CSV table of C-alpha atoms and ligand atoms in Angstrom, one decimal:
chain,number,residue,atom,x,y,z
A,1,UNK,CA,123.1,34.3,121.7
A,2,UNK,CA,120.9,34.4,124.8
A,3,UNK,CA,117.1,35.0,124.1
A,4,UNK,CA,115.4,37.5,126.5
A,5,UNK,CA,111.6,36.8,125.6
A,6,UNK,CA,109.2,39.6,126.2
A,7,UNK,CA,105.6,38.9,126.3
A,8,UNK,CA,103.7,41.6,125.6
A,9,UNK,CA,99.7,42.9,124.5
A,10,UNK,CA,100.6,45.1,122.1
A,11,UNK,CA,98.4,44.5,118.9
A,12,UNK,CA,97.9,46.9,115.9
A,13,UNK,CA,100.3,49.2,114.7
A,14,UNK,CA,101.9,49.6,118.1
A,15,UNK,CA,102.8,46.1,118.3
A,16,UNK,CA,104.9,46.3,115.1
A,17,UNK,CA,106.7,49.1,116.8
A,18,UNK,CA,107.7,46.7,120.1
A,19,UNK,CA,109.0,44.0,117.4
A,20,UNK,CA,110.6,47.5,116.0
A,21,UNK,CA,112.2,48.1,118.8
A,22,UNK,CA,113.2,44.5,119.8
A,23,UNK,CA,114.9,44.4,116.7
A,24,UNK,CA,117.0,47.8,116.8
A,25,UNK,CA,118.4,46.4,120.7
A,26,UNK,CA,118.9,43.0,118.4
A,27,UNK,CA,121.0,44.5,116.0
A,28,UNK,CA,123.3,47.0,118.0
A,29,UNK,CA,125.0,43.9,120.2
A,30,UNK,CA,125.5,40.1,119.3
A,31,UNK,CA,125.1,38.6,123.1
A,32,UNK,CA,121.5,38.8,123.7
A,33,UNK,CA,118.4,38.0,121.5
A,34,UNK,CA,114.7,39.9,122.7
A,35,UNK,CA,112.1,38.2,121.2
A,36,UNK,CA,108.7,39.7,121.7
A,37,UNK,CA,105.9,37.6,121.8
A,38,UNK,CA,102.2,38.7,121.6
A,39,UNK,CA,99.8,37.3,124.1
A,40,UNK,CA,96.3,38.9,123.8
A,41,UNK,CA,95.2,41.1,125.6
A,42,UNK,CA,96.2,43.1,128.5
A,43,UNK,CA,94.5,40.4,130.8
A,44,UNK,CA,95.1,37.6,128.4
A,45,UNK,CA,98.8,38.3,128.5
A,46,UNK,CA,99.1,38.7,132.5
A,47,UNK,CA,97.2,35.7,132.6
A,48,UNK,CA,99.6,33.6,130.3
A,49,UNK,CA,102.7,34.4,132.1
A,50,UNK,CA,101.3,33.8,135.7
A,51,UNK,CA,99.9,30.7,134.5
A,52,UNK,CA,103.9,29.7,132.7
A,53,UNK,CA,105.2,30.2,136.2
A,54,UNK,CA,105.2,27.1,137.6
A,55,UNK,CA,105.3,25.2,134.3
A,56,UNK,CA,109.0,27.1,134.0
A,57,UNK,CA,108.2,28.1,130.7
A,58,UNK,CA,107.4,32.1,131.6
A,59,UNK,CA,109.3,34.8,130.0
A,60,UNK,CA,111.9,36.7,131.1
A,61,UNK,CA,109.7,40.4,130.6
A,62,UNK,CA,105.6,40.4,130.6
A,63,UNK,CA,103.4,43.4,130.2
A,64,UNK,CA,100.8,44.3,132.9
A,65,UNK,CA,98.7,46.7,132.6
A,66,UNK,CA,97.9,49.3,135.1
A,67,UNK,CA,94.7,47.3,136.2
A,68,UNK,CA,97.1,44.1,137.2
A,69,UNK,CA,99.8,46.2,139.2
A,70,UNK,CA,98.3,45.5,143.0
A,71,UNK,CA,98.3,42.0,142.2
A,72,UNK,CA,102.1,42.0,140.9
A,73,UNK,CA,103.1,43.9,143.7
A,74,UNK,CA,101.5,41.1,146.0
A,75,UNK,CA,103.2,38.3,143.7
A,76,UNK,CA,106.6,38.8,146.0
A,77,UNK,CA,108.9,35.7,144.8
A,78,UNK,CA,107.6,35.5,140.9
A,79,UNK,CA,109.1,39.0,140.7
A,80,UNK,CA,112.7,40.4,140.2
A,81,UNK,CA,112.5,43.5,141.5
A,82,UNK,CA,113.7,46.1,137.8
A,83,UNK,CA,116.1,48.4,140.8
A,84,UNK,CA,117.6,44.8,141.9
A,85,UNK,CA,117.8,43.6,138.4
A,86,UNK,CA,119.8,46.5,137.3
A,87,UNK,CA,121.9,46.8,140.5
A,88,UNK,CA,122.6,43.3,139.9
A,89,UNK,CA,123.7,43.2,136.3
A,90,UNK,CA,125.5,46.8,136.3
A,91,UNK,CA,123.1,48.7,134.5
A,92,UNK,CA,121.3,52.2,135.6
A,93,UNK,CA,118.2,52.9,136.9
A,94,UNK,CA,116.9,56.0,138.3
A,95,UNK,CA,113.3,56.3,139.0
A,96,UNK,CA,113.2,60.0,139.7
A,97,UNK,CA,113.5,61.0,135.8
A,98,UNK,CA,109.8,59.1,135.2
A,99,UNK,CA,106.9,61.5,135.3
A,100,UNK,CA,106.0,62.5,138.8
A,101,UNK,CA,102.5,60.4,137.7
A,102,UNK,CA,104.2,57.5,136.9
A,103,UNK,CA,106.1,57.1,139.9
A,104,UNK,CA,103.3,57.8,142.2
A,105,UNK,CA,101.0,55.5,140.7
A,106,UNK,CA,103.8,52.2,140.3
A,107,UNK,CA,106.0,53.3,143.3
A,108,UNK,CA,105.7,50.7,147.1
A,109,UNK,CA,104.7,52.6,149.8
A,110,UNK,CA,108.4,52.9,150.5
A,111,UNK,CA,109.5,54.4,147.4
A,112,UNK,CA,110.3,51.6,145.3
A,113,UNK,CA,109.8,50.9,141.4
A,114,UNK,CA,109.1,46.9,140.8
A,115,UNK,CA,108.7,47.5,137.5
A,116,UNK,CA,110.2,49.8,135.1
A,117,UNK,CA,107.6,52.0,133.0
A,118,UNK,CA,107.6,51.9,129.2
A,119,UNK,CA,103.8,52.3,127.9
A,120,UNK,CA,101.9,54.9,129.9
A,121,UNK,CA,98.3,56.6,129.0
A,122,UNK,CA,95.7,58.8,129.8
A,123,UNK,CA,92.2,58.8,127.7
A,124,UNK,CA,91.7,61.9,125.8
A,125,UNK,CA,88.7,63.9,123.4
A,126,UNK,CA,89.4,61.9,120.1
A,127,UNK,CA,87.3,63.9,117.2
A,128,UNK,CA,86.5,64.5,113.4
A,129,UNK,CA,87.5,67.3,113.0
A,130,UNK,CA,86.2,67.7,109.2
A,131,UNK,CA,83.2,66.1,110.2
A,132,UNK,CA,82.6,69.0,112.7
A,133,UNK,CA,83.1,71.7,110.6
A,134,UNK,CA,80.4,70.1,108.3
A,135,UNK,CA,78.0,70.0,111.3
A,136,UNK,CA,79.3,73.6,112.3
A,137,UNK,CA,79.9,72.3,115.3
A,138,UNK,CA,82.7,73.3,118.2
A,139,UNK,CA,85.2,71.0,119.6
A,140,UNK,CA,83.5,70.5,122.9
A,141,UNK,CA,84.9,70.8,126.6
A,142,UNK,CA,81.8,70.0,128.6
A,143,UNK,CA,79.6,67.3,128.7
A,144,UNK,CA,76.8,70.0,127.5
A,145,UNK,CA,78.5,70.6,124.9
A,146,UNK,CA,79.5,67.2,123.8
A,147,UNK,CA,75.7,66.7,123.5
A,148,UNK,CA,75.3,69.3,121.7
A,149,UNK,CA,78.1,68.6,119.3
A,150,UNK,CA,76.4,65.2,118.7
A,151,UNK,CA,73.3,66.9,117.9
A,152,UNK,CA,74.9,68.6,115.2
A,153,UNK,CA,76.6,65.9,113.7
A,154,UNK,CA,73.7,63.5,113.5
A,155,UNK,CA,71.5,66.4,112.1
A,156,UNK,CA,74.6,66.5,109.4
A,157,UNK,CA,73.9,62.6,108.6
A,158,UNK,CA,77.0,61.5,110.6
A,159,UNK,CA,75.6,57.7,112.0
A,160,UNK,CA,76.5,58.8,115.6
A,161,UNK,CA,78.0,61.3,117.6
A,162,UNK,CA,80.0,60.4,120.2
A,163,UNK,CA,81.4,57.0,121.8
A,164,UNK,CA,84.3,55.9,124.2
A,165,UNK,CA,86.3,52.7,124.5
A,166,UNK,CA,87.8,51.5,127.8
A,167,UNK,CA,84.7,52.4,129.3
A,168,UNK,CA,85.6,51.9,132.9
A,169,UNK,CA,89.3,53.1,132.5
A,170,UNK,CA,87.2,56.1,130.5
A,171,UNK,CA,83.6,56.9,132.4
A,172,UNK,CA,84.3,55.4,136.0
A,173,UNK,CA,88.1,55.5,137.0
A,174,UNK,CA,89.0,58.9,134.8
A,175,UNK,CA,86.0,60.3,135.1
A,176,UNK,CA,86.3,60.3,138.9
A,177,UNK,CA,89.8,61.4,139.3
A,178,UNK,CA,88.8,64.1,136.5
A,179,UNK,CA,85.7,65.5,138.6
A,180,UNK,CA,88.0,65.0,142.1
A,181,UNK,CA,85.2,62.1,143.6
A,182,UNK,CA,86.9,59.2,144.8
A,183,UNK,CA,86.7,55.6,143.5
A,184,UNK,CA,87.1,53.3,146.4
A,185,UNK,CA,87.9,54.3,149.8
A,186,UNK,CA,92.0,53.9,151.1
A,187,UNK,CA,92.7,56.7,148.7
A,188,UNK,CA,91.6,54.4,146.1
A,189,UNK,CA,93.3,51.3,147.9
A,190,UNK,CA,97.1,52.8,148.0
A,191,UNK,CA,96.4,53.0,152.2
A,192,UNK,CA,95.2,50.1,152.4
A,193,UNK,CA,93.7,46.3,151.4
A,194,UNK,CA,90.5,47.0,153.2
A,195,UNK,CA,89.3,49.3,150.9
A,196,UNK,CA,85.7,49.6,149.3
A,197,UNK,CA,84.6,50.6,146.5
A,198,UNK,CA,82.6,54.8,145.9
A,199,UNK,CA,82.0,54.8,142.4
A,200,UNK,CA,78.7,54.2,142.9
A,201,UNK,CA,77.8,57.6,143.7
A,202,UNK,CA,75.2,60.2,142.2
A,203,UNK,CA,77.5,62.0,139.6
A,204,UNK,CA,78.9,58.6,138.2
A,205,UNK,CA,75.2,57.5,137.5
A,206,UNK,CA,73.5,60.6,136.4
A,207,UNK,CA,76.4,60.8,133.7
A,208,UNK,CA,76.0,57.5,132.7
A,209,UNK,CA,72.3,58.0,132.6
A,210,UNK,CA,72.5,60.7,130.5
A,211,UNK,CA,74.8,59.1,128.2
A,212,UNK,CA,72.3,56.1,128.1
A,213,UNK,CA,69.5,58.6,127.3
A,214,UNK,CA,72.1,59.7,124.3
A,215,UNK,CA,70.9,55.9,122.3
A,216,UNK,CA,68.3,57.2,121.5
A,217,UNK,CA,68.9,59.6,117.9
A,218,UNK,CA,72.1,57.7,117.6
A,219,UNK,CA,74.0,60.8,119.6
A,220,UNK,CA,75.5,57.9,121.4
A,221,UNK,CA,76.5,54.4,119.9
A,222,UNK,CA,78.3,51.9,122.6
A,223,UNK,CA,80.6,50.3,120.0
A,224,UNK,CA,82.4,47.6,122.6
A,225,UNK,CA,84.9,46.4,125.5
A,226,UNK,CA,88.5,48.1,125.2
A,227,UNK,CA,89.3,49.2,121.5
A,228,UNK,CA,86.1,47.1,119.9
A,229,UNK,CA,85.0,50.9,119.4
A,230,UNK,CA,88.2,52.4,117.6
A,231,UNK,CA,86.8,51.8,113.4
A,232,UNK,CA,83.6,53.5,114.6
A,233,UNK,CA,86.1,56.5,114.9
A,234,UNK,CA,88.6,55.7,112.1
A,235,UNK,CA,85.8,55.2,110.0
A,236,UNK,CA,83.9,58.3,110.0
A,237,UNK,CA,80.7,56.6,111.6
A,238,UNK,CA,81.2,58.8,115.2
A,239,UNK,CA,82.4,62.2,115.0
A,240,UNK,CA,83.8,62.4,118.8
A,241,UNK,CA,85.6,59.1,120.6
A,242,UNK,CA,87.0,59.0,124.1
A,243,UNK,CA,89.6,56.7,124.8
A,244,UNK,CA,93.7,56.7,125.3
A,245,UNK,CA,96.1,58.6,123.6
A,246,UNK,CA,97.6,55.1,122.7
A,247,UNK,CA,95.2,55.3,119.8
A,248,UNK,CA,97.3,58.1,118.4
A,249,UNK,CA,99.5,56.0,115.8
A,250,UNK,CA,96.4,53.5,114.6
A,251,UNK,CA,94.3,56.8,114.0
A,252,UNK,CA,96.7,58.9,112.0
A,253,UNK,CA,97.5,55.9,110.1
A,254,UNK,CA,93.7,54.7,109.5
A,255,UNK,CA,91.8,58.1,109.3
A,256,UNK,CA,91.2,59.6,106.3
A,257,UNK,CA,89.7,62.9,107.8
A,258,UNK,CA,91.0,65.5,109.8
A,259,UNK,CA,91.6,64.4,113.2
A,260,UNK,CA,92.2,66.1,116.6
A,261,UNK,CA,92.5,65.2,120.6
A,262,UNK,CA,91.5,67.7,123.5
A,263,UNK,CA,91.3,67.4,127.2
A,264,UNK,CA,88.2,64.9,128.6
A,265,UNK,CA,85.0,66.9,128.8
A,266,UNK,CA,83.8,68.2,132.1
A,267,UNK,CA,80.7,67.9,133.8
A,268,UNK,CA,79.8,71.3,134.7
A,269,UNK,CA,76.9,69.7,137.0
A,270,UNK,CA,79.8,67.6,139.0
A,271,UNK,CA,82.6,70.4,138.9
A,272,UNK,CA,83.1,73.9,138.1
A,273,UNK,CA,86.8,73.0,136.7
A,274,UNK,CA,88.8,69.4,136.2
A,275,UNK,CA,91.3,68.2,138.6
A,276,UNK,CA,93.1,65.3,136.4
A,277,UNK,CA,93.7,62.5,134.7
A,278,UNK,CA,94.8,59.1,135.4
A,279,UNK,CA,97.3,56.6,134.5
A,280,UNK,CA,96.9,53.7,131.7
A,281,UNK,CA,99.1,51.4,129.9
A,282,UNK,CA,101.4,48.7,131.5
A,283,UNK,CA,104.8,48.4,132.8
A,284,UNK,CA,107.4,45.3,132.5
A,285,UNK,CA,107.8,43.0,135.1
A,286,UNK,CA,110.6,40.9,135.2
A,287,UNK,CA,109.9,37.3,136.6
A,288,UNK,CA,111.9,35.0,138.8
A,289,UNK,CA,113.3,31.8,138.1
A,290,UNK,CA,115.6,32.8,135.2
A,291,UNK,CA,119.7,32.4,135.2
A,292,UNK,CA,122.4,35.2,135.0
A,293,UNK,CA,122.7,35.8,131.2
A,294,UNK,CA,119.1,35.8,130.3
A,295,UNK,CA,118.7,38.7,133.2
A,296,UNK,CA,121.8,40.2,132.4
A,297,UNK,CA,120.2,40.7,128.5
A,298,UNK,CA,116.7,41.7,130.1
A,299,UNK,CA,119.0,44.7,131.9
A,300,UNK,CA,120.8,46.0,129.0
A,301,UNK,CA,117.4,45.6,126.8
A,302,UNK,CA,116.0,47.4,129.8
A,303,UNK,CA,119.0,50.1,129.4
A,304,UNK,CA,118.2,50.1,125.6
A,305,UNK,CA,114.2,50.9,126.4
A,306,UNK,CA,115.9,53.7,129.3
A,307,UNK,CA,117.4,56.1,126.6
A,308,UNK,CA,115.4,59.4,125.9
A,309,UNK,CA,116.0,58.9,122.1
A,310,UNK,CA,113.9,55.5,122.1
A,311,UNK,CA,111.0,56.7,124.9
A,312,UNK,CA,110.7,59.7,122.5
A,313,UNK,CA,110.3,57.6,119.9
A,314,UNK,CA,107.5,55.2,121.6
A,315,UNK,CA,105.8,58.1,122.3
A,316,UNK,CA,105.9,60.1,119.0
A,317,UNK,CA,104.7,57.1,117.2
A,318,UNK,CA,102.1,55.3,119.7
A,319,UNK,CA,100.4,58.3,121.8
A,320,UNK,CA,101.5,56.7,124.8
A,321,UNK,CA,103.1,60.0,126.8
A,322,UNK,CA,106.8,60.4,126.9
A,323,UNK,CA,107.5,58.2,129.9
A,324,UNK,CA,110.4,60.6,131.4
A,325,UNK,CA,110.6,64.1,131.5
A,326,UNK,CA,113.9,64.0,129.4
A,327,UNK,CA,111.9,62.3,126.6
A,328,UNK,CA,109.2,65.2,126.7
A,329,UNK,CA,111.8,67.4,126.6
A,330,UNK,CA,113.4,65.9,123.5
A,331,UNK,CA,110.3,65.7,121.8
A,332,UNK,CA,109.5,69.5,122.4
A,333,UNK,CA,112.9,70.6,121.1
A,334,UNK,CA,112.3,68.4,117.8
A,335,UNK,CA,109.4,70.1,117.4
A,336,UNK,CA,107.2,67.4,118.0
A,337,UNK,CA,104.1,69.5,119.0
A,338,UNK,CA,104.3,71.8,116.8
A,339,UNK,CA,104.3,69.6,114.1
A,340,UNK,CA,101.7,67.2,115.4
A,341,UNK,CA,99.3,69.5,117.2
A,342,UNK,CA,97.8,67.9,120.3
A,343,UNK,CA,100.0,65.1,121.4
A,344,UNK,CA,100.8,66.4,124.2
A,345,UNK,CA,96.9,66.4,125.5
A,346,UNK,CA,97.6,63.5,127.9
A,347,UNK,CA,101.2,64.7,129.1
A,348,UNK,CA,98.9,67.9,130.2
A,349,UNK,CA,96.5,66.1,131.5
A,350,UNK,CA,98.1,63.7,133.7
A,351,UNK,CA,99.8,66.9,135.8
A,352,UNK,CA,96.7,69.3,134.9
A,353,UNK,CA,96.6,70.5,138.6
A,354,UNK,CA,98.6,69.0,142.2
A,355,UNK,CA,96.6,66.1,142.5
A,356,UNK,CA,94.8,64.4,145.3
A,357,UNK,CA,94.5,61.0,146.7
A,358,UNK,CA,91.3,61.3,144.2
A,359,UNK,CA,93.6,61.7,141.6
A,360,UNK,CA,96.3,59.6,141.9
A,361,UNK,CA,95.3,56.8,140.3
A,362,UNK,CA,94.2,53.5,141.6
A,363,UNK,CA,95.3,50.4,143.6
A,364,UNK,CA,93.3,47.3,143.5
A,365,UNK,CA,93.9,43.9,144.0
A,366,UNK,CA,92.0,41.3,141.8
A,367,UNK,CA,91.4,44.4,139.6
A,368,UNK,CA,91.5,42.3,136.6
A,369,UNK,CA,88.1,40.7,137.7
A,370,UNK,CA,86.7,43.7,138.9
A,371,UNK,CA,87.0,45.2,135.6
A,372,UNK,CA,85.0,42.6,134.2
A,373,UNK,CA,82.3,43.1,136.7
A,374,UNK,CA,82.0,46.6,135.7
A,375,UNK,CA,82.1,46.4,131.9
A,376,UNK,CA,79.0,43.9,132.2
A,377,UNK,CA,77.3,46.5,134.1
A,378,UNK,CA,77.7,48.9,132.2
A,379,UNK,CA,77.0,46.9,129.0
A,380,UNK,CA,73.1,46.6,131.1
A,381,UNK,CA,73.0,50.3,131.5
A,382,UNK,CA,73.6,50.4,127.4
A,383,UNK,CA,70.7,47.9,126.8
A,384,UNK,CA,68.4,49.7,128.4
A,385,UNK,CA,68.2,46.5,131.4
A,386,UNK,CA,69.4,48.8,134.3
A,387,UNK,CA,69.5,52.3,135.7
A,388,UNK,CA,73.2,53.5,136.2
A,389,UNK,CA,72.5,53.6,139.9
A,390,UNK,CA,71.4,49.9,140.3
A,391,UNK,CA,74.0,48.7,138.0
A,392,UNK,CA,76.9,50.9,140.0
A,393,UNK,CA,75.4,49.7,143.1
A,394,UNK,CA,75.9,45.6,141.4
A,395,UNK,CA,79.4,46.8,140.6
A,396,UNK,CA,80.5,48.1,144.0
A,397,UNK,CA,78.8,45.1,146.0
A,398,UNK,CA,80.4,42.4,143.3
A,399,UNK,CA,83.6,44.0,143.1
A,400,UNK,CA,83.8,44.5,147.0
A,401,UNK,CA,83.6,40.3,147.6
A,402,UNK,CA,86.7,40.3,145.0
A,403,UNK,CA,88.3,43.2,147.0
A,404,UNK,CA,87.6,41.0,150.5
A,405,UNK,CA,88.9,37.9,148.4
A,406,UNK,CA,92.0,39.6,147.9
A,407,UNK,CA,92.5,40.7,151.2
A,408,UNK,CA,92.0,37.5,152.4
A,409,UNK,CA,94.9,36.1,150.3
A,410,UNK,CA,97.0,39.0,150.8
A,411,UNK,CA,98.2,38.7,154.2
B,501,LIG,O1,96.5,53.0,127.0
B,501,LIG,P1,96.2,51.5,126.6
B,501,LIG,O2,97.5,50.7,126.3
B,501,LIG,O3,95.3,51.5,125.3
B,501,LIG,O4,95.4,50.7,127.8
B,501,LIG,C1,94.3,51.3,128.4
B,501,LIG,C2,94.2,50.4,129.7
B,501,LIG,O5,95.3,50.5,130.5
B,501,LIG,C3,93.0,50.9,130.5
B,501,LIG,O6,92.9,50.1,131.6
């Protein structure tokens, strides 16, 4: 057999559903071998397979996340472009049945998919349910309310009331796209490498003030980078949790309350109504350098990952949406929504309204870095060391030298 290695960041209970479905394509044929291997995380994991490149021992598949994608676009000659790769080894591929979200945010500026979606998120209203009708508190849809929701559940004894992971994915990028401000100039780089960046703007800080101002009585507990935060939730310490619907299969699994998930809360001071959400997750890149059978097996695992029956599947176990409109569809039919109420939050949310180059998502190169930058700033704002305006203002002017060191490279 021919071994078609996937490297991927899926830890937790959605990682044993990749090596689930590795296994499934492994045991319908006897040609090729996947074999998914886990990296890290998302940045660990791009970082590996660049860094195999040249040392010829990269894998045929890696996962990027959504925050990598301008700089795997720019990577032209470590990349088999997926419509190529399929042309090229007889198998399908028709970008027009992904969500309209996910083929504006991945697709060139000539139409093209590099990559072929698999894992795609939005962050939704994680909450205790059970815990809030101790409180007799409401699921909340503004930020007023989500205060006021935390009131009542540290009044009932619960240790805090609300948290988020992802923080910049969560309270900068989504938040913006969600109250229809813009997060760098160039329609959030897709016209352009010269782009800026906005989010250090007046309604970004005074909501990350606020939430700051939320430490104090435990109404807000910053619990970590990424998914640090996700046992505050599962545990029962803090009643409300924002962060992706990826979370869905570690939560229903872990929890032993009465969960839910509801659209992100809306600043009533920024907006009168959302506009929506934004895209998280990864897609699989295919690398060069590879010979004919080991990218004829990454095609028909491809194909395998392609069916409705398996995206379905992803989705109903993981959270992550249902990556093509077909796979919604099956879902529905199934009865999938009725019989888990809320999954499909971030399928909603993603297409709550036509969107705007606001909403669209984002397009950064050196991204990866830039996400660090703002993390550490925020992490100030948390201790109590900045205001949200000067460390937004840190963030923008840091991550614009990384923008300008992209562009630099880039042409
Ligand atoms: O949805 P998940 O896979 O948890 O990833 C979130 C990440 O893409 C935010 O940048």
């Amino acid at each position: 057999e021919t071994e078609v290695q996937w490297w991927h960041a899926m830890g937790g209970a959605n990682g044993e559903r990749v090596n689930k479905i590795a296994e499934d394509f492994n045991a319908t044929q006897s040609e090729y071998k996947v074999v998914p291997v886990y990296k890290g995380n998302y940045t660990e994991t791009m970082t590996a397979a660049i860094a195999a490149f040249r040392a010829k021992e990269h894998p045929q598949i890696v996962q990027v996340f959504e925050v990598g994608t301008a700089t795997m676009m720019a990577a032209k000659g470590a990349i088999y472009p997926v419509e190529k790769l399929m042309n090229d080894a007889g198998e399908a591929f028709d970008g027009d049945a992904f969500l309209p979200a996910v083929v504006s945010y991945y697709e060139t500026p000539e139409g093209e998919l590099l990559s072929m979606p698999f894992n795609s998120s939005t962050p939704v209203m994680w909450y205790n349910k059970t815990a809030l009708d101790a409180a007799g508190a409401s699921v909340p849809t503004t930020w007023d309310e989500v205060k006021e929701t935390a009131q009542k559940l540290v009044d009932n004894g619960m240790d805090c009331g609300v948290s988020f992971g992802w923080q910049s994915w969560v309270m900068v990028e989504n938040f913006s796209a969600w109250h229809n401000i813009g997060m760098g100039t160039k329609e959030n780089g897709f016209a352009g490498f010269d782009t800026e960046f906005s989010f250090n703007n007046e309604a970004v800080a005074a909501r990350l003030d606020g939430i700051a101002a939320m430490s104090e009585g435990n109404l807000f507990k910053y619990g970590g980078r990424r998914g640090d935060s996700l046992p505050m939730f599962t545990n029962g310490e803090c009643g409300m949790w924002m962060n992706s619907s990826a979370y869905y299969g570690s939560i229903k699994s872990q929890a032993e309350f009465e969960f839910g998930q509801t659209m992100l809360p809306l600043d009533t001071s920024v907006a009168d109504a959302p506009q929506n959400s934004i895209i998280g997750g990864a897609t699989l890149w295919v690398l060069a350098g590879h010979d004919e059978e080991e990218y004829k097996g990454t095609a028909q695992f491809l194909t395998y990952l392609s069916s409705p029956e398996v995206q379905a599947w992803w989705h109903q176990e993981t959270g992550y949406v249902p990556i093509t409109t077909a796979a919604y569809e099956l879902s529905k039919e199934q009865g999938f929504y009725e019989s888990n109420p809320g999954t499909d939050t971030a399928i909603q949310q993603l297409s709550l309204n036509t969107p705007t180059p606001n909403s669209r998502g984002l397009r950064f190169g050196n991204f990866v870095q830039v996400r660090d930058v703002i993390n550490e700033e925020l992490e100030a704002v948390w201790a109590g060391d900045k205001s949200a305006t000067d460390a937004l203002n840190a963030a923008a002017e840091r991550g614009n030298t990384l923008l300008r060191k992209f562009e630099r490279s880039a042409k």
